[PDB]
RNA sequence: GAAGCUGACCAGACAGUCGCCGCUUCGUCGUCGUCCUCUUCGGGGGAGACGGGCGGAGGGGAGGAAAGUCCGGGCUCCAUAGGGCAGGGUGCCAGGUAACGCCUGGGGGGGAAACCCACGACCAGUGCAACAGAGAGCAAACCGCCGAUGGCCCGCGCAAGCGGGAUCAGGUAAGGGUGAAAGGGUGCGGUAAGAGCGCACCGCGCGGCUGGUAACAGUCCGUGGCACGGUAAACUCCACCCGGAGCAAGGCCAAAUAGGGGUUCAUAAGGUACGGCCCGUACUGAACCCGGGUAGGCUGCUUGAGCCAGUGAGCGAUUGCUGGCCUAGAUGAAUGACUGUCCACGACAGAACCCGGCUUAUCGGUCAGUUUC
RNA sequence: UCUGGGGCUACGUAGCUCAGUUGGUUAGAGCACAUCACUCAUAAUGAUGGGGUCACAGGUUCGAAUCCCGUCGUAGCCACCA
């Protein structure tokens, strides 16, 4: 079961505001993750790519698609922790292989 | 035998992955002032239907540009009888829904080494360092200006005739030159060191002849050596607007603040649409808070003048007609990697109201048209 | 350290604040750091250090900036019931 329903995506800015009021910061100077412990069990994801933070509008959409595919491909493996991914300016230089391996190393250490 | 640029033109992919989205059939939860079968009222046998509502079966969802209302049009509450007309737009003529800044060519040049029209009245007022007042008025001519119409001085017995003295409205300044791009031509008695003072020749306004739906094209006839050939949203003209802001603008379910409050009222400066300009026509008010609530939704253009072949007409873009095609749009926001045959390597960007254009980042494939030998 | 359809503007006049219907003008002032009677060392009643291509080739008389359909970024706000 590796589906991707609409209910598994954020649809209200209120939840965004709540998680941004008290975010948990842990990541790298190039890519980082914010989020908090969830109570409903089913993991959730969210995407915030600022035009100022990330220029080259041909990106983001590609980045959104790639990160959504990685999330749905590794939905069950990751714990109930909510996750939101934010990429800094220096991301486009790394290719897809580098991005995939960096995300793999990142998510292979969150062992609690 | 080898090379530019536009007219247009191409951005498919699959045997497995993993699977984001409207529709029809079978049922799954609650019903219908068309109700037959019954109505004994648990609803069974329905002709037509809904909801972020699940299980199957099918067709589909990225550029020559959607960023950029940059220009014009398609569609809502609230006004709308100018002989007012301030102010922004065709400025060569004709052309399709109401539409403009797309396209055709003659008179004017670089009608091939430039595809460019943005070619409308110019002393109908008195203005910007080049401090040479020539690009608005000026001239102690610049090794020619007494080498003579008007005065003086140096050489004179009928008071004849030469050189200079940069003195004056002394032919002058473009026939010569010094920073401004030489703002016409040798010439006939221009001879007075010569200022167009009468001059065949190219060119201006005015009118006839060949064409013109239209700007004009040939000194064929005249008058003038002529008198400004040169800087336009730099006073001005309209046959089409004068309607603001735009699609997040009307419509809804058993939820309760029309809530102290402000510049004073029987004509006058509170929000006169239409004039930061005078009216025609008249809401029981007048720069704000002290948020009472809100993400549960949908038609509005989603069968929209977009497309193909065949007709009297063209230097040029056309559809009166014949089949159709039309199976791409939920508002955190629609596309991933691999075992492969042409190989033109995936450069840069985005699909949620629509169309006609923009020398654009556009490497790659040439049908029409170039000079070279 | 918050937002993809959409808008009237302020800017490359040094990166901000004042803005010129080309007043032929290497020209102004208030932030990083500086010299003079040693402010009992929290800057301007005085002289100045002035990489102010005043965005890219653009008026074929000499020109940047009022005359750009060819590009970037920040700040003044918007769905109803009366
Ligand atoms: Ca294509
Ligand atoms: Ca458009
Ligand atoms: Ca309204
Ligand atoms: Ca298609
Ligand atoms: Ca649409
Ligand atoms: Ca819609
Ligand atoms: Ca086209």
Residue numbers in the entry: 2 to 113
List sentences from the manuscript.
Ribonuclease P (RNase P) is an endonuclease whose primary role is to remove diverse 5′ leader sequences from precursor tRNAs (ptRNAs). Bacterial RNase P consists of a ~400 nucleotide P RNA and a single protein (rnpA, ~120 amino acids). RNase P recognizes the shape of the stacked acceptor and T-stems which span the two domains that together form a molecular ruler. In bacterial RNase P the 3′ RCCA of ptRNA pairs with a loop or internal bulge in the C-domain (L15), while a conserved adenosine in the catalytic core contacts an optimal U(−1) flanking the cleavage site 5′ to N(1).
To better understand how unwinding occurs and delineate the structural basis for such plasticity, we used cryo-electron microscopy (cryoEM) single particle analysis (SPA) to determine the structures of holoenzyme and ES* complexes formed with ptRNA_GG and ptRNA_AU. The ptRNA_AU substrate has the optimal consensus leader while ptRNA_GG contains the slowest dinucleotide sequence at N(−1)N(−2). We measured a 13-fold lower kcat/Km for ptRNA_GG compared to ptRNA_AU in single substrate assays. In contrast approximately half of the bound ptRNA_GG dissociated rapidly while the remainder was still bound. In both ptRNA_AU and ptRNA_GG bound complexes, the 5′ leader is positioned with the correct phosphodiester bond placed in the active site, while the 3′ RCCA is trapped in the L15 internal bulge loop of RNase P. In contrast, a larger nucleobase at the N(−1) position of ptRNA leader sequence, as in the case of ptRNA_GG-bound complex, sits in the cavity between J5/15 and J18/2 of RNase P thereby forcing the A248 nucleobase to tilt away from the leader sequence and stack with C73 of ptRNA. As such, RNase P uses a rotating glycosidic bond of A248 to help sculpt a flexible binding site to accommodate different nucleotides at N(−1), all while maintaining the correct active site geometry for the transition state. The N(−2) position of the ptRNA leader stacks with A333 of RNase P in both the ptRNA_AU and ptRNA_GG complexes. Notably, the distribution of the three classes identifies a significantly larger proportion of ptRNA-bound RNase P for the ptRNA_AU (~80% ES* complex) over ptRNA_GG (~46% ES* complex) dataset.
